[PDB]
Enzyme design. Structure first.
Site, mmCIF file in Angstrom:
data_model
loop_
_atom_site.group_PDB
_atom_site.id
_atom_site.type_symbol
_atom_site.label_atom_id
_atom_site.label_comp_id
_atom_site.label_asym_id
_atom_site.label_seq_id
_atom_site.Cartn_x
_atom_site.Cartn_y
_atom_site.Cartn_z
ATOM 1 N N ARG A 51 -10.571 0.170 9.005
ATOM 2 C CA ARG A 51 -9.311 0.302 8.239
ATOM 3 C C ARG A 51 -8.114 -0.112 9.102
ATOM 4 N NH1 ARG A 51 -11.105 5.449 9.232
ATOM 5 N NH2 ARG A 51 -9.913 6.487 10.890
ATOM 6 N N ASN A 52 -8.232 0.043 10.431
ATOM 7 C CA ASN A 52 -7.127 -0.224 11.352
ATOM 8 C C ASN A 52 -7.292 -1.528 12.108
ATOM 9 O OD1 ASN A 52 -5.856 2.216 10.591
ATOM 10 N ND2 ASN A 52 -6.925 3.368 12.172
ATOM 11 N N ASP A 81 -2.315 0.251 14.034
ATOM 12 C CA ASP A 81 -2.235 1.704 13.912
ATOM 13 C C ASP A 81 -2.236 2.510 15.194
ATOM 14 O OD1 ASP A 81 -2.812 4.424 12.358
ATOM 15 O OD2 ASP A 81 -2.439 2.830 10.917
ATOM 16 N N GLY A 117 0.817 -1.190 0.000
ATOM 17 C CA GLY A 117 0.000 0.000 0.000
ATOM 18 C C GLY A 117 0.853 1.241 0.000
ATOM 19 N N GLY A 122 0.671 5.824 0.228
ATOM 20 C CA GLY A 122 -0.138 6.929 0.673
ATOM 21 C C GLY A 122 0.590 8.247 0.663
ATOM 22 N N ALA A 123 -0.175 9.300 0.883
ATOM 23 C CA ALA A 123 0.386 10.608 1.102
ATOM 24 C C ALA A 123 1.188 10.421 2.371
ATOM 25 C CB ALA A 123 -0.718 11.622 1.312
ATOM 26 N N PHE A 124 0.833 9.367 3.093
ATOM 27 C CA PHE A 124 1.374 9.042 4.404
ATOM 28 C C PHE A 124 2.538 8.043 4.400
ATOM 29 C CE2 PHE A 124 -1.869 5.765 3.796
ATOM 30 C CZ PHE A 124 -1.140 4.636 4.112
ATOM 31 N N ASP A 135 -7.777 5.921 17.336
ATOM 32 C CA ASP A 135 -7.985 5.780 15.905
ATOM 33 C C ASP A 135 -8.575 4.445 15.498
ATOM 34 O OD1 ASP A 135 -8.184 6.537 13.327
ATOM 35 O OD2 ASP A 135 -6.070 6.442 12.862
HETATM 36 C C1 DJK Z 1 -6.872 -1.077 4.786
HETATM 37 C C2 DJK Z 1 -5.443 -1.209 4.124
HETATM 38 C C3 DJK Z 1 -4.348 -1.956 4.893
HETATM 39 O O1 DJK Z 1 -4.232 -1.670 6.057
HETATM 40 N N1 DJK Z 1 -3.453 -2.971 4.265
HETATM 41 C C4 DJK Z 1 -2.482 -3.769 5.068
HETATM 42 C C5 DJK Z 1 -2.339 -5.154 4.747
HETATM 43 C C6 DJK Z 1 -1.512 -6.000 5.488
HETATM 44 C C7 DJK Z 1 -0.778 -5.491 6.633
HETATM 45 N N2 DJK Z 1 0.055 -6.325 7.382
HETATM 46 C C8 DJK Z 1 0.708 -5.847 8.453
HETATM 47 N N3 DJK Z 1 0.594 -4.516 8.819
HETATM 48 C C9 DJK Z 1 -0.186 -3.636 8.130
HETATM 49 N N4 DJK Z 1 -0.329 -2.212 8.505
HETATM 50 C C10 DJK Z 1 0.527 -1.554 9.488
HETATM 51 C C11 DJK Z 1 -0.013 -0.576 10.322
HETATM 52 C C12 DJK Z 1 0.820 0.027 11.274
HETATM 53 C C13 DJK Z 1 2.179 -0.347 11.379
HETATM 54 C C14 DJK Z 1 2.732 -1.322 10.545
HETATM 55 BR BR1 DJK Z 1 4.619 -1.853 10.668
HETATM 56 C C15 DJK Z 1 1.883 -1.922 9.592
HETATM 57 C C16 DJK Z 1 -0.923 -4.133 6.982
HETATM 58 C C17 DJK Z 1 -1.785 -3.274 6.211
#
Ligand code: DJK
Ligand code: CL
Ligand code: CL
Length: 305
Positions: free
Chosen positions: A142-143, A156, A23, A25-27, A138
């Site tokens: 999505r999280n 997140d 993925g 992002g702007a982020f 948060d």
């Molecule tokens: C809704 C989109 C999404 O979140 N895709 C995604 C798919 C797999 C995955 N595996 C492990 N970690 C994350 N996100 C993440 C969030 C905060 C910190 C870290 Br190191 C990883 C995803 C996200």
């Protein structure tokens, strides 16, 4: 408070292959990859998160601090950081993605058994955070991430803070009223966000207050308006969501109650969610693509002293 003795593990970039973007992002970006711990003979599927350059390191580092401090089956934990360049966060890969995307992709195949189990598991992750005095701030579909269809974890921790502490875009549509007006955040404001997350699941990924603008929302909320009852929802379920959205924060359910209630309902799912062709549905759980992957170990099975 009590000393936080969590170990922050530093990982050499040589240790892993950043196999693909997941993925962007702007982020900043998230990659999938493999992590081979030095001299251990194990291959661990991971997600790698990254990216001024100095002032984004600080935000990312806070996230690592929180993530490295949590340990529960329904919370994602940091495997470690990698210090090259901009700082990288390393975590267990959640192969099926985030729950929001997953419900959208699979609405036809998702049964009431699963919907309610996720509600139980998310409330357990949140209860764990409350036990450690973390206010997540948060929570949203999505999280929440999908390890397998039967197993989700909260993630997140970028906005996370200790209860009582005060330390871009804020998630208006998931926030408790007091949060929007007064920037007040308690475990009970997390409960409100939980309500919205549950609604997101029950609607198979609908956008809350679709069309409305964030400036509008505190106003809509003050008039007493709320998210509408989802079609599959019995009044039993919807009223749990509604209790998560009371004005009096102490009037909302506690996460430990949410676990209890959803858990009862999960004994008899067809009595609480009405889903067409519910009985038929099945969700699929080798899976690890690479040919020489029989040294593969999930992070949940990789434990350190
Ligand atoms: C809704 C989109 C999404 O979140 N895709 C995604 C798919 C797999 C995955 N595996 C492990 N970690 C994350 N996100 C993440 C969030 C905060 C910190 C870290 Br190191 C990883 C995803 C996200
Ligand atoms: Cl928003
Ligand atoms: Cl959509």
């Amino acid at each position: 408070e009590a000393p936080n003795q969590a170990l922050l593990r530093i990982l050499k970039e040589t240790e892993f292959k950043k196999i693909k973007v997941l993925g962007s992002g702007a982020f900043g970006t998230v990659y999938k990859g493999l992590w081979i711990p030095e001299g251990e003979k194990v291959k661990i599927p991971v997600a790698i998160k990254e990216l001024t350059s100095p002032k984004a390191n600080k935000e990312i580092l806070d996230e690592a601090y929180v993530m490295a401090s949590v340990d529960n089956p329904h919370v994602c934990r940091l495997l470690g950081i990698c210090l090259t360049s901009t700082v990288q966060l390393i975590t267990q890969l959640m192969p099926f993605g985030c729950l929001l995307d997953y419900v959208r992709e699979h609405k036809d195949n998702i049964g009431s058994q699963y919907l309610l189990n996720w509600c139980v598991q998310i409330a357990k992750g949140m209860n764990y955070l409350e036990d450690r005095r973390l206010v997540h701030r948060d929570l949203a579909a999505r999280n929440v991430l999908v390890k397998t269809p039967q197993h989700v974890k909260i993630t997140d921790f970028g906005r996370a803070k200790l209860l009582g502490a005060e330390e871009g875009k804020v998630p208006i549509k998931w926030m408790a009223l007091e949060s929007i007006l007064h920037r007040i955040y308690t475990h009970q404001s997390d409960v409100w966000s939980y309500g919205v997350t549950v609604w997101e699941l029950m609607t198979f990924g609908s956008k809350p207050y679709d069309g409305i603008p964030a400036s509008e929302i505190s106003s809509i909320l003050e008039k007493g308006e709320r998210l509408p009852q989802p079609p599959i929802c019995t009044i039993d379920v919807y009223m749990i969501m509604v209790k998560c959205w009371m004005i009096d924060a102490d009037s909302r359910p506690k996460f430990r109650e949410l676990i209890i209630e959803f858990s009862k309902m999960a004994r008899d799912p067809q009595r609480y969610l009405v889903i067409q062709g519910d009985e038929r549905m099945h969700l699929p759980s080798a899976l690890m693509d690479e040919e020489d992957m029989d040294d593969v170990v999930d992070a949940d099975e990789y434990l350190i002293p």
